[PDB]
Structure formats: C-alpha cells, structure tokens
C-alpha cells in the first residue's frame, strides 16, 4: 500500500543520510558557492596538485587516490545495503555477490552528485579537481574519468535528489540478475517492492518530469557499461604497469567479476 511505500522511501533516505557523510545537497551547495566558510581548493595542473597535498609520478598518485576513495565508498555502501529491509536475511554469499556486482555502479551514481561538466569534488568536498587536468594524464590514466563525466552530465540533468537517489541505489543493489546468485526469487521480490517505492517517489517528488521513472531505469543499464569500460582499463594497467597492484579490498571485488 501507498503509506507502506512512503515509509520505505523515508527509511531508505534516513539510512542514506546515516551512511553517506557527503550528500548531493551538500555537494551542490559547495559546487554553486551557496555555503558559508568553505571554498574548495582547485587542482588544475601539476603545481596546483603540489599545493593541495597539505590540505610516485602524477598519474599513479591520482590513481592511488581514487583507490583510497573507492575503498571508503565500498564501506559506506555496505553499511547502506545492510539497512535495506530484507537484505541482511539473504544468504550471505548472495549478499557478497550483490555487493561485488553493485558497488561500482553505486560509486559512479554517487560520483555524479559531486561532479559538473568542469570537474569533481575531492577530499570530502574540500577540493575540486578539473576535468581538464584529469584528461591531461598520460596513457593509460588520462581516459579513466571521461566516461564518468559523460554519464554525470546527462544523469545530473534528471535533477534527482538524495531522497530519489536512496531508492535508486537500493534498486541497483537488489538486482536478481547478478552472476552466481544462489536464490534469485527473494532478491527479485525485494527489488519489486523497491521499484514500486521508486515509482511512487518519482511521481510525487517530480510530478511534471516526463517519463522520469523510465529514464532512471535506463540509467541503471548505462551504469553497467561504465563498469565494463573501467574494468577493461584496469586489465590494461595490470598487464602493462606491472609494478602496481590494487588495494586488497578492490582486488577482492574485481576478482572473477563477470
């Protein structure tokens, strides 16, 4: 029923606030300068990057920075998943599978919140790295962020807020079609209810946004292609940048992925 769907929506929003210290609302306030005493440090070149260290080669430093950020996000997203009703009762192997296949899709969703066409917030919003600086990085590091910016500009045009995002993220995590899932039915049942909640949320929160629900569902499929592309890049780096290795948590996620 409708009241149940709204209580679910609100529960997910509350869990989202509890799990993710930097929200889209906060990020947008920083990006448009509608905040008090906190104007972010801009990284646009090598010298800019040097100055921002107080507050290896350049491309590796950036790469390793994304990795540390990524492991923090994995921890936050796991804490969020555990508050999705029904999730912690799933077979624990299926929870691992859901997390393994869903976590990067969520990371790139939430990255969009921190992005505009010109760059991305770093260091909990204390810094801003330009899209152009990231593009300047040597092969094969210079192309890693471009598909994420491309996605973000179009995704951000949908004007979703944190309350919409909380349900969106939950729907993605509870995907019954991940490889290796033992018990698909209970996952699909939870996702079905989350989808109803999302549909009602989008209708009430954005009544005049045409076919918003359909548009959002398509974005979920687009996210998988972004992950695919990123994984391909990571295999290039593993093969040809042999001195390096991923953080152990990231190694675990990427091992036997697809």
């Amino acid at each position: 029923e409708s009241a149940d769907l709204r209580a679910l929506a609100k529960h997910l929003y509350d869990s989202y606030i509890k799990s993710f210290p930097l929200t889209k609302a906060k990020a947008r306030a920083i990006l448009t300068g509608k905040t008090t005493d906190k104007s972010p440090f801009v990284i646009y070149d090598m010298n800019s990057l040097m100055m921002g260290e107080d507050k290896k080669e350049v491309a590796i430093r950036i790469f390793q920075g994304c990795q540390f950020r990524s492991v923090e996000a994995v921890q936050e997203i796991t804490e969020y998943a555990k508050s999705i009703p029904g999730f912690v009762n799933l077979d624990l192997n299926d929870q691992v599978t859901l997390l393994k296949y869903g976590v990067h899709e969520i990371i790139y969703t939430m990255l969009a919140s921190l992005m505009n066409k010109d760059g991305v917030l770093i260091s909990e919003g204390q810094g801003f790295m330009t899209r152009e600086f990231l593009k300047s990085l040597r092969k094969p590091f210079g192309d890693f962020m471009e598909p994420k910016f491309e996605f973000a500009v179009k995704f951000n045009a949908l004007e979703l807020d944190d309350s919409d995002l909380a349900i969106f993220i939950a729907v993605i995590i509870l995907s019954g079609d991940r490889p290796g899932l033992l018990n698909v039915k209970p996952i699909e049942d939870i996702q079905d209810n989350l989808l109803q909640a999302l549909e009602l949320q989008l209708k009430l929160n954005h009544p005049e946004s045409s076919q918003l629900f359909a548009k959002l569902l398509q974005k979920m499929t687009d996210l998988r292609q972004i992950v695919t592309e990123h994984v391909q890049l990571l295999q290039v780096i593993k093969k040809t940048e042999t001195d390096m290795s991923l953080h152990p948590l990231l190694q675990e996620i990427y091992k036997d992925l697809y």
Binding site: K82, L249, I253
Partner: peptide, 10 residues
C-alpha cells in the same frame, strides 16, 4: 573475505 567482514559487523 573482507566483504564478509564488512557485511557482518555490528
């Protein structure tokens, strides 16, 4: 291994 630990922490 690490994912299981994160999933079962209280």
């Amino acid at each position: 291994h690490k994912l299981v630990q994160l999933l079962t922490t209280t």
